Symmetry: C2
Subunit: 285 residues, 2 copies
């Protein structure tokens, strides 16, 4: 009831970390569509995903009948993340063992980047998406031209994935060296945050390592969005980027899939600041 | 920057506790008066004072140009409590050693109640106070008839005291067995919360052990408020009630005064559920 026994939770050297994030335009999409339960899940997912990149298990979370529908989603999001419930914004508190806190300072050139699939746009890029959908003469309750089994609104309102459960096992085992929750600004803006402001290291991202999900292929064509713009606006099907040493890449991938997260090798660390893209001319085929 | 090293903070067996409280009508008083910096301090004081009763040091706190003035008060309140900043409502997170968490289960009949003076009404009872002031033909910017050196508004807007600093030393030394932050409902509603719902123990409060502060003597007369009503509505000059064993009463009092809190013996624990008052006919003289 508000108090958490950290030792009973398994922590003998706990470090407290705090995360915060918001939703934004996706709420306007939930309004115009009528269903708001997902945006409550998004507010939790975004907040707790910002904790897991540091290796922390979430503990607390804090943030009209519209408000009633969202609060039910927040509840569903906490149950999926495993934390206690206390333009939108959320705040979560988590804990991580001192020896397991991320990112580590052992990151070097040659380390491998892994990618976790996203459920969709998550909670970023909806201002542009709405424009592309409208100019294509579509409405939220139309059948999605890329997924005939669902409507445009439902596909866009798909809740942000919660990456707490599938990552904690590898965090406890020291399989990961750093992570980046892919939110606004795509790969270009998010991945560099793993390194220091004056770090000589960056990443090389192989955009041919996977096939673009259908929703992004459609948005890319319907909106005449060039590949270099896609990777700077949307998550492009990747919800989380994780850096791991080469000798641990197999174990990390096995752990992620064991916990139900589709993962693959998407790039590598190199001695060049920023994000460098391979196959920009093939991205989207 | 959002992360707290609990071991570095001195905790080898930390327990996390969460506190929450609001201000309420005192904000309307700040509006009608023009100065809102104090209500920001109140929102912090109330939240952190609900943590200290459990023995916990506050760590995090979270909650128009009116909003600008209050945020400055919240800042001033966090600096006084020592926590990091993240009808109003606040939420604070604190930490306490397992062996120091309060209340203890060793409370028994014969233990002594100590009282800490309040700065004024703190954050409760302003609906009735406003009525009494108005019917007395006074306004917020009139000179307080009980304190000629200040105005009615300033005296009523006095910020709630922060009891973190003067209590932590005694919490670490195990001098206290339990506390009750006196908020709404006066002694009658707050003190019983220290015990279990089915506890056979209560308290005997000696209302002749101290002189009522001038503001309460005035409100008691101006508003024709009977003593049994005072102790069920206002804090009556006592911001915190603390239970201590008889053999530790001297040490506790010495510790509280050493840290600048005027404290005195106000009652004792006895085998009778509820709050029992002594000297109700003398209260206010």
């Amino acid at each position: 009831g508000g108090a958490f026994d950290l030792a009973k939770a398994g922590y003998k050297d706990p470090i407290l970390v705090s995360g915060t994030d918001g939703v934004g335009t996706k709420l306007r999409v939930a309004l115009d569509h009528g269903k708001h339960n997902t945006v409550g899940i998004d507010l939790v997912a975004m907040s707790v995903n910002d904790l897991i990149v540091q290796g922390a298990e979430p503990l607390y979370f804090l943030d009209v009948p519209v408000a009633a529908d969202v609060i039910t989603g927040i509840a569903e999001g906490c149950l999926q993340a495993g934390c206690a419930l206390i333009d939108l914004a959320g705040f979560a508190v988590g804990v991580v063992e001192r020896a397991q806190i991320l990112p580590t300072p052992d990151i070097a050139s040659g380390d491998v980047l892994l990618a976790l699939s996203s459920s969709g746009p998550h909670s970023n890029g909806f201002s542009l998406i709405r424009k592309i959908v409208s100019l294509s003469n579509l409405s939220l309750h139309d059948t999605a031209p890329w997924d005939k089994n669902t409507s445009v609104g439902d596909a866009l309102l798909t809740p942000t994935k919660v990456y707490i459960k599938p990552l904690l096992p590898g965090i406890k085992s020291g399989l990961y060296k750093g992570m980046s929750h892919i939110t606004g600004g795509g790969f270009t803006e998010n991945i560099p945050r793993i390194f220091s402001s004056a770090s000589n290291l960056g990443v090389k991202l192989d955009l041919t390592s996977y096939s673009l999900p259908a929703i992004w292929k459609w948005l890319m064509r319907a909106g005449n969005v060039e590949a270099k713009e896609m990777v700077r606006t949307f998550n492009c099907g990747v919800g989380m980027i994780i850096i791991v040493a080469k000798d641990k890449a197999d174990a990390a991938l096995s752990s992620l899939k064991e916990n139900g997260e589709e993962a693959w090798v998407i790039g590598e660390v190199q001695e060049k600041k920023g994000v460098e893209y391979v196959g920009l001319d093939k991205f989207g085929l």
